[PDB]
Write a protein that binds this DNA or RNA. Structure first.
Lengths: 48, 31, 203, 9, 101, 154, 202
RNA sequence: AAAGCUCCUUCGACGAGUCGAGUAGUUUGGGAAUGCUGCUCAAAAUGGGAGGUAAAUUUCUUCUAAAGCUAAAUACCGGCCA
RNA sequence: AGGUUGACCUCGGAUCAGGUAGGAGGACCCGCUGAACUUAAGCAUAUCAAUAAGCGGAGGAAAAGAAACCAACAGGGAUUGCCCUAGUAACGGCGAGUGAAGCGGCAACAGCUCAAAUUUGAAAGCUGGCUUCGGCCCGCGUUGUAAUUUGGAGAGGAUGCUUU
């Protein structure tokens, strides 16, 4: 498998220590939906 | 610049089939 | 009430060309009839009932026959506009009376129809034979197939023995009762739930 | 399987 | 169909005609959910993920603020019914995630 | 030229009075065309899918690994839409598929499918869920190294 | 068919993948010219449902237009008549930026006919559109009955007269009671309602 | 080779920065019920629009938007012939 | 030979092969933009007027047009135009004023084409060039050109007759 050059942070853009909940940037980065994403991924894997 | 006669008279294949099997008929109605 | 406060003189329309336009329309109709001979100049139209309560007492000509009407009359929808039958796909048949009247209309037209063959040397089974191809024909379907009875008959004689007894309590009281029930349909049903809930609570 | 339509044959 | 009373006023008013039952017009099938459309929309949803306002509504619904989530959904989408449907869909998403976890 | 020769043979067969299936055999070809390949994957007829890595716009193929994973089809991302076009006698091809092969190559197809599975999909099982990019420039990396060295020294 | 998946993906414009693609494409189209030619449509499902075909005689032109309101070209932005209780910063153009894009693309390519156009991306300053054009002079166009209606001279500059989709939307050509003043043409309807008719035997 | 008619278990894809909402300007008889455009937000799957008084709930009736073509009846202080 | 040899993608050049656009006319038509005199005692809502001037774009007509319609009826059924609805519903400082639409009668009537499906047992499609006029090439095109389907349905079946 030929892999590209990889950056230091391979995760989704998240900044979970910030308490602000105003705007789409805050809803993207401050909101933690890791449980939702892991549950949906596990459900898809079990169906597969 | 006007379209040619052949290009203006070209029709689709479904239109050709429908005109082949159901053209305008010659008819009369009894009084 | 005179609406002359705009520049009204720039769009005054007169009608000196009214007889000339009548002459032009008559010439166009004669040319259309000569081009369409021996077919009639117009298409067959169904009989439909006008909307609203002001005009639902009268029937008139509609746009075209419904698909259900053509299916019941036995005329395919691709053949129908090629033999002078107007077809409407938006209209539906919500009752049997109009459907049966239009099916009977289509059957009369199909019985009076003369169908010439596409090729004179090879007639087909659905084609009118040459010895019945000659008859007295019509060229106005709006005249030969008009609305014969647009309104209901306004006068009818019955014997004195068969006079109906009528609505008990009177027609005026029946109308008042109908209006009162229509106004009180909701409140009576609400107190019906209230009585049912009270009975369920204190059963 | 997912099908857009019933296919001939 | 309920037979009309034959009167000009009141409940079930109008001229009495025998009514016909009609087959469903194919133009009235719009809104029916098809199997391929289910599969394609599910695949696109699990590929693309969620919108930021959808994430905010999901966080409110997990925290249990339901009226606040409905009000936020109405302010974002525009109408109360669309907000209610979106909140129901995100409740369903939360339910599938919980039943997987 | 092969199609013209086959059509000439079939026309000869029709003129002499046998069906075209008497002279022509069932073909086995690489399946291509994006809509056709997606339909085959949805109908679970595709045995192996090869997707080009440089399709522009990327939306035409971005759903394809997820579709293949849901349908159970083995897929592999390969470099060169022009390389697939050389297979399909075109300039470019976005995706190609194998549904079935001949009996002398079914063993080779099974070996290739197993090799693609074990050597590609198990290796990209974890890395396909990661975010790409984020690489810094050369001068930015040198500045970052210099300031981290200064912070460590001080 | 992939185009169904592209349709449902294009529906989700707030997703991460679509936002990334929109951002990089906004940067690229900003570095390109205001009007330039696209080699292929960047939204093939949208182009196909609006009428684009992969046939010789169909071209795509990408264009960006400055967004916002309209300003009246008066000296120093002031009017010397009766007071208006408003400024030129709140004047609204009665047509769309999509229509402006279509006319500028048609003027750039006066030999073609505009078929339709579609939004592709936007930022604070510009809105980006892709316009489908058909060559009325090409033999493949002229032999195709599904498209050679546009070779007739009645469809010269449809975008200049409002005969495109955004033109009909701005003209309000819809059926019903909400469109009483505009469905047959606003000025024609006004003329019909303001014409005084006098017959011979009145 | 194509095409029409009758019946049917089943299937039956249907147009997104669009619809819609707020706001601003303009417009309308629709200064509570109008349309258009700009900015912001931004959809859904028996879903959506409309049903001329705001809203919630339960129903009902009608069509099926965001792609496209098409003669005629209609206008005509320009041109040509009468 | 691989430090080479190519395949694509994007972007260019050419007095390259073949084409097209501009201007005029503008009475009528489709849009954009847009007044003031006037009328309100005067006058920033309003009226003149969604008019004049200005700008862009067609044709012999244009436009519109085959319902995301009207309705609420026993239901009508694309568009346009005439009569009527009707100076009516409705809007309107301090009021001067403004003002439709459904139904009904008539003139004229005409219906349709795509996107969303795999031809996959065979891109069956097409521009151009050379022709001995049989065809043969250079290509476009699978990031989709033909056939089939467009909601009135259709696809798959069953079934037995008709059609060119």
């Amino acid at each position: 498998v030929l892999k590209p050059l990889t950056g230091d942070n391979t995760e989704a853009p998240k900044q979970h220590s910030q308490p602000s909940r105003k705007g789409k940037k805050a809803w993207r980065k401050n909101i933690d939906l890791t449980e939702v994403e892991q549950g949906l991924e596990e459900l898809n894997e079990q169906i597969i | 610049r006007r379209l040619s006669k052949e290009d203006a008279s070209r029709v689709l294949e479904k239109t050709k089939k429908r005109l082949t099997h159901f053209p305008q008929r010659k008819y009369a109605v009894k009084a | 009430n005179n609406h002359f406060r705009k520049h009204w003189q720039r769009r005054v329309r007169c009608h000196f060309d009214q007889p000339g336009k009548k002459v032009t329309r008559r010439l166009a109709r004669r040319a259309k009839a000569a081009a369409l001979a021996p077919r009639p100049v117009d298409k067959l139209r169904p009989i439909v009932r006008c909307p609203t309560v002001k005009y639902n007492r009268r029937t008139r000509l509609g746009r075209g026959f419904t698909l259900e009407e053509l299916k019941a009359a036995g005329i395919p929808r691709l053949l129908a506009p090629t033999i002078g039958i107007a077809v409407d796909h938006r209209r539906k048949n919500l009752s049997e009376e109009s459907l049966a009247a239009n099916v009977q209309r289509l059957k009369d037209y199909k019985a009076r129809l003369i169908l010439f063959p596409r090729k004179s040397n090879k007639p087909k089974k659905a084609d009118t034979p040459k010895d019945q191809q000659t008859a007295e024909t019509t060229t106005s379907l709006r005249t030969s197939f008009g609305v014969e009875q647009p309104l209901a008959p306004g006068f009818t004689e019955i014997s004195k023995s068969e006079i109906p007894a009528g609505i008990e309590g009177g027609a005026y009281r029946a109308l008042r009762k109908a209006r009162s029930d229509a106004r009180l349909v909701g409140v009576r049903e609400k107190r019906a739930k209230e009585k049912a809930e009270a009975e369920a609570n204190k059963k | 399987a997912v099908s857009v339509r019933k296919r001939a044959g | 169909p309920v037979e009309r009373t034959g009167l000009i006023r009141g409940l079930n008013k109008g001229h009495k005609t025998t009514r016909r039952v009609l087959k469903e017009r194919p133009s009235r099938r719009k809104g029916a959910q098809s199997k391929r459309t289910q599969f394609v929309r599910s695949l696109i949803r699990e590929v693309a993920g969620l919108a930021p306002y959808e994430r905010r509504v999901i966080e409110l619904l997990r925290n249990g603020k339901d009226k606040r989530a409905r009000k936020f959904s109405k302010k974002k989408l525009g109408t109360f019914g669309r907000a209610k449907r979106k909140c129901e869909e995100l409740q369903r998403i939360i339910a599938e995630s919980r039943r997987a976890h | 030229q092969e199609k013209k020769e086959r059509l000439l043979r079939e026309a000869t067969a029709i003129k002499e009075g046998k069906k075209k299936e008497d002279v022509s055999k069932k073909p086995y070809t690489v399946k291509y065309g994006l809509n056709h390949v997606v339909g085959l994957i949805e109908n679970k007829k595709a045995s192996l899918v090869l997707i080009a890595n440089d399709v522009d716009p990327i939306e035409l193929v971005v759903f394809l690994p997820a579709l293949c994973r849901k349908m159970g089809i083995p897929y592999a991302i390969i470099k060169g839409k022009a390389r697939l076009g050389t297979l399909v006698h075109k300039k470019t091809a976005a995706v190609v598929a194998i549904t079935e092969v001949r009996s002398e190559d079914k063993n080779e197809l099974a070996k290739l499918i197993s090799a693609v599975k074990e050597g590609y999909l198990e290796k990209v099982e974890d890395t396909r869920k990661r975010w790409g990019g984020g690489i810094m420039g050369f001068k930015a990396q040198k500045r970052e190294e210099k300031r981290k060295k200064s912070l460590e020294t001080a | 068919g992939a185009l169904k998946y592209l349709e449902e993906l294009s529906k989700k414009k707030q997703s991460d993948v679509v936002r990334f693609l929109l951002r990089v494409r906004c940067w690229e189209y900003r570095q390109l010219n205001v009007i330039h030619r696209a080699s292929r449509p960047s939204r093939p499902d949208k182009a196909r449902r609006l009428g684009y075909k992969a046939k010789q005689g169909y071209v795509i032109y990408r264009v960006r237009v400055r967004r916002g309101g309209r300003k009246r070209p008066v000296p120093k932005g002031a009017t010397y008549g009766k007071p208006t209780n408003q400024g030129v910063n709140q004047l609204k153009y009665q047509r769309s930026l999509r229509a402006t894009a279509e006319e500028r693309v048609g003027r750039r390519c006066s030999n073609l006919r505009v078929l339709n156009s579609y939004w592709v991306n936007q930022d604070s300053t510009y809105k980006y559109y892709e316009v489908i054009l058909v060559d009325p002079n090409h033999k493949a166009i002229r032999r195709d009955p599904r498209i050679n209606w546009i070779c007739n001279p009645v469809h010269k500059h449809r975008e200049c007269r409002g005969l495109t989709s955004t033109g009909k939307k701005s003209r309000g050509l819809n059926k019903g009671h909400r469109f009483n003043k505009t469905r047959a043409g606003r000025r024609k309807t006004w003329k019909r309602h303001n014409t005084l008719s006098l017959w011979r035997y009145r």
